[PDB]
Amino acid sequence: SGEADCGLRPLFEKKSLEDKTERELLESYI
Amino acid sequence: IVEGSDAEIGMSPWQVMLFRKSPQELLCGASLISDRWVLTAAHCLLYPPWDKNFTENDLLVRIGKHSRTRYERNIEKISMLEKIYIHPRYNWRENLDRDIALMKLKKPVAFSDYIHPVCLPDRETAASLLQAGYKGRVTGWGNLKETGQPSVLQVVNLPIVERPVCKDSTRIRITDNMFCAGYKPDEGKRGDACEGDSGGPFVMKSPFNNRWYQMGIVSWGEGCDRDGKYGFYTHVFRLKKWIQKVIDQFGE
Amino acid sequence: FEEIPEEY
Ligand SMILES: NC(=[NH2+])NCCC[C@@H](C=O)NC(=O)CN1CCC[C@H](NS(=O)(=O)Cc2ccccc2)C1=O
Numbered sequence: 001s002g003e004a005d006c007g008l009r010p011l012f013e014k015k016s017l018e019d020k021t022e023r024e025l026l027e028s029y030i
Numbered sequence: 031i032v033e034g035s036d037a038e039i040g041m042s043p044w045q046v047m048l049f050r051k052s053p054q055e056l057l058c059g060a061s062l063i064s065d066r067w068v069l070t071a072a073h074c075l076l077y078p079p080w081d082k083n084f085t086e087n088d089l090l091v092r093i094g095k096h097s098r099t100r101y102e103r104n105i106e107k108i109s110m111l112e113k114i115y116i117h118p119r120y121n122w123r124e125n126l127d128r129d130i131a132l133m134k135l136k137k138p139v140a141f142s143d144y145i146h147p148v149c150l151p152d153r154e155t156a157a158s159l160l161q162a163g164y165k166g167r168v169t170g171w172g173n174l175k176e177t178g179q180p181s182v183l184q185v186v187n188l189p190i191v192e193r194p195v196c197k198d199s200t201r202i203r204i205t206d207n208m209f210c211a212g213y214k215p216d217e218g219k220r221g222d223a224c225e226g227d228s229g230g231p232f233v234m235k236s237p238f239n240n241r242w243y244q245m246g247i248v249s250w251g252e253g254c255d256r257d258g259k260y261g262f263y264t265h266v267f268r269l270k271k272w273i274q275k276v277i278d279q280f281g282e
Numbered sequence: 283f284e285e286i287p288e289e290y
């Protein structure tokens with residue numbers, strides 16, 4: 001949305017690595 | 031940030047530090063939206079009741095930082111501002127309604143493992159994620175306690191709270207351009223933004239396309255991490271059209 | 283607050 005390569009982090013999404021608490025977020029969306 | 035944790039390197043690549051040239055001091059947080067545009071809270075620049083009114087030459091933007099005070103030698107990039115745009119209907123006289131501003135950089139910043147733009151929400155991303163109970167993430171170098179400073183970027187994950195609950199926790203008149211977030215006295219989990227975090231981003235990770243979306247701007251609160259009190263944030267999607275307008279009409 | 287290079 002606000003960019004193109006927007007919101008995909010070089011050190012996490014782009015390498016398919018997850019940060020330490022992002023699952024907490026994802027588990028809250030039901 | 032109160033009751034948060036140290037961020038991991040490269041965790042919030044769109045996090046920007048608003049820095050005053052003299053005295054050299056941390057003014058507020060902000061976020062990178064493209065290679066030339068930064069989004070922050072209007073009250074970081076203009077707050078007349080406190081004789082606050084910064085101009086483009088008063089500040090610097092610092093991108094790709096982790097350490098609060100250190101000059102991050104070949105990691106961070108420092109930019110000068112070309113122009114500041116405050117929402118025309120920013121209400122500093124009463125409730126900080128429409129607390130938003132755009133800053134255009136003199137020159138585009140180059141992306142790296144530590145510098146990358148966040149996405150702006152579309153009506154549909156807004157509609158499925160801005161729901162009470164859903165958690166967002168707030169980041170900043172602000173105060174650790176109401177009444178000290180972190181040495182590194184701090185992060186906290188907070189649930190969006192139902193509007194009525196937001197309304198009933200304060201005497202300030204709440205508008206459609208705001209949302210509140212935090213834990214309820216009973217959830218027995220806590221955390222909040224605090225002085226120094228203003229203008230930083232409230233983000234959510236789309237379960238649809240796994241991209242990070244900026245849903246709010248740290249705006250205001252009463253004290254920090256007070257039981258039965260909640261942090262309030264500018265509603266980015268509701269002001270998106272003004273965002274598009276200035277970019278289109280003025281830059282990029 | 284560590285100093286920023288003067289070019290800035
Ligand atoms: N999440 C929190 N508990 N607080 C975040 C506070 C962030 C902080 C900047 O970093 N923002 C401000 O100080 C914005 N601001 C401006 C003046 C004082 C005000 N706090 S206050 O308790 O007076 C309530 C108030 C009064 C007028 C308009 C909005 C809210 C207020 O919150």
Ligand SMILES: *[C@@H]1O[C@H](CO)[C@@H](O)[C@H](O)[C@H]1NC(C)=O
Nearest residue numbers: 075076077078082083084085
């Ligand atoms: C804010 O500063 C600019 C010039 O520096 C001007 O628009 C205005 O009069 C100043 N004061 C207020 C209240 O905005």
